[PDB]
Amino acid sequence: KNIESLFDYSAGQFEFIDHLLTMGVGVHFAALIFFLVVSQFVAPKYRIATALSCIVMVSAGLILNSQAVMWTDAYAYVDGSYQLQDLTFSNGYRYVNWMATIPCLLLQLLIVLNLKGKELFSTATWLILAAWGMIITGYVGQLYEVDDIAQLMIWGAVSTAFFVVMNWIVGTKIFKNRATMLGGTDSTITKVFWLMMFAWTLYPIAYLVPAFMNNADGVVLRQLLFTIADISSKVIYGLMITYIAIQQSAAAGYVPAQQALGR
Numbered sequence: 001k002n003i004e005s006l007f008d009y010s011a012g013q014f015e016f017i018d019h020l021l022t023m024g025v026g027v028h029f030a031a032l033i034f035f036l037v038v039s040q041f042v043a044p045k046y047r048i049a050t051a052l053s054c055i056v057m058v059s060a061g062l063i064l065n066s067q068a069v070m071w072t073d074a075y076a077y078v079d080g081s082y083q084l085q086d087l088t089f090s091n092g093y094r095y096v097n098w099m100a101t102i103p104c105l106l107l108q109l110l111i112v113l114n115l116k117g118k119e120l121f122s123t124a125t126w127l128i129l130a131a132w133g134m135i136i137t138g139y140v141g142q143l144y145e146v147d148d149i150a151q152l153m154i155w156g157a158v159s160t161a162f163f164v165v166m167n168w169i170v171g172t173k174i175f176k177n178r179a180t181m182l183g184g185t186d187s188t189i190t191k192v193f194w195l196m197m198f199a200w201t202l203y204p205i206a207y208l209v210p211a212f213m214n215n216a217d218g219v220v221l222r223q224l225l226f227t228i229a230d231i232s233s234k235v236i237y238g239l240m241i242t243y244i245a246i247q248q249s250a251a252a253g254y255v256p257a258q259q260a261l262g263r
């Protein structure tokens with residue numbers, strides 16, 4: 001049910017996909033250590049936002065590791081190409097994991113936007129419902145990327161509706177709350193918005209690869225898009241969220257944040 005199963009792979013194609021995923025693992029787990037160490041310089045009000053980046057680093061890192069091992073489990077080099085041995089690799093495992101990681105990405109945004117109490121809980125609930133609707137419909141849609149491309153497109157259209165509503169909530173909360181933000185992070189958070197719009201849109205482009213490049217090189221392109229998108233939406237994003245957290249902490253008078261930025 002996945003286009004990966006349709007092709008034999010050259011060593012170059014197969015090993016490049018493996019190296020992309022392994023590089024992704026190393027980037028996420030290196031970033032994890034950074035987020036862990038700097039969390040002590042974040043004030044209590046914001047510290048969960050940096051903890052959430054640690055959670056996302058390990059959760060996404062584990063899925064990228066799992067995809068890499070599944071990839072090498074599923075194929076063997078036979079007669080000059082990597083040939084399918086087991087019908088077990090699928091990008092669908094990424095979608096299941098997004099059910100956890102996308103809420104974490106959204107929640108750490110809400111924390112540095114200074115949302116509290118009922119608004120934080122209400123906003124998180126609606127964002128997570130929209131995200132889950134997007135993920136579930138996209139997951140069903142990619143089950144058909146071989147058998148029924150029309151069905152892939154229609155589930156993709158429904159998923160995109162959820163995506164667009166989710167992004168409207170995200171953008172509205174960012175632009176309505178950037179005046180609360182301290183230490184110049186009213187500017188920084190605007191760039192976070194655009195980083196999200198760019199990086200998250202790479203995922204529906206990857207989803208459509210079976211429709212516009214259904215060959216072994218499109219399989220590579222999709223893994224490349226996922227890799228660009230993962231590093232941008234989780235690592236670069238998380239570094240920006242943590243910068244905003246530490247900068248607002250120092251502006252609020254948290255001494256460890258002030259001393260950390262002074263060094």
Ligand SMILES: *C/C=C(C)/C=C/C=C(C)/C=C/C1=C(C)CCCC1(C)C
Binds near residue numbers: 105204
């Ligand atoms: C770290 C993982 C992230 C930020 C994943 C984000 C995923 C999406 C924005 C997925 C979007 C989709 C659509 C807009 C339509 C096609 C189906 C999806 C689920 C791939």
Ligand SMILES: CCCCCCCCCCCC
Binds near residue numbers: 119122123168169172
């Ligand atoms: C006013 C408090 C917001 C409650 C949750 C709103 C969730 C939808 C956000 C739409 C843009 C404001």
Ligand SMILES: CCCCCCCCCCCC
Binds near residue numbers: 190191194195198
């Ligand atoms: C304040 C404007 C920041 C814009 C950042 C660019 C991210 C989106 C560019 C997409 C162009 C294809």
Ligand SMILES: CCCCCCCCCCCC
Binds near residue numbers: 227228231232
């Ligand atoms: C070997 C190709 C690497 C692909 C992943 C690079 C991620 C780029 C995201 C933005 C980096 C500044």
Ligand SMILES: CCCCCCCCCC
Binds near residue numbers: 023030034
């Ligand atoms: C394969 C190891 C990749 C390490 C990249 C370093 C990323 C820096 C994150 C702070």
Ligand SMILES: CCCCCCCCCC
Binds near residue numbers: 091
């Ligand atoms: C797309 C096939 C792989 C699916 C991964 C596991 C999904 C189980 C929950 C629906």
Ligand SMILES: CCCCCCCCCC
Binds near residue numbers: 126129130133165
């Ligand atoms: C307060 C209502 C905001 C609309 C959120 C829509 C998300 C779709 C989830 C079903």
Ligand SMILES: CCCCCCCC
Binds near residue numbers: 025026029030033
């Ligand atoms: C210092 C932590 C980096 C761990 C990278 C592990 C890559 C398999």
Ligand SMILES: CCCCCCCC
Binds near residue numbers: 154156208
């Ligand atoms: C007619 C093509 C529409 C495709 C919509 C799918 C978007 C992910």
Ligand SMILES: CCCCCCCC
Binds near residue numbers: 169
């Ligand atoms: C992608 C939708 C952006 C919403 C911007 C709303 C500004 C108040």
Ligand SMILES: CCCCCCCC
Binds near residue numbers: 240261
């Ligand atoms: C002293 C550590 C500062 C960390 C800033 C976070 C974003 C780079």
Ligand SMILES: CCCCCC
Binds near residue numbers: 063066
């Ligand atoms: C990387 C271990 C495989 C399970 C993925 C959560």
Ligand SMILES: CCCCCC
Binds near residue numbers: 171197
């Ligand atoms: C405000 C519209 C954002 C568009 C992102 C592609």
Ligand SMILES: [Cl-]
Binds near residue numbers: 059060
């Ligand atoms: Cl992920």
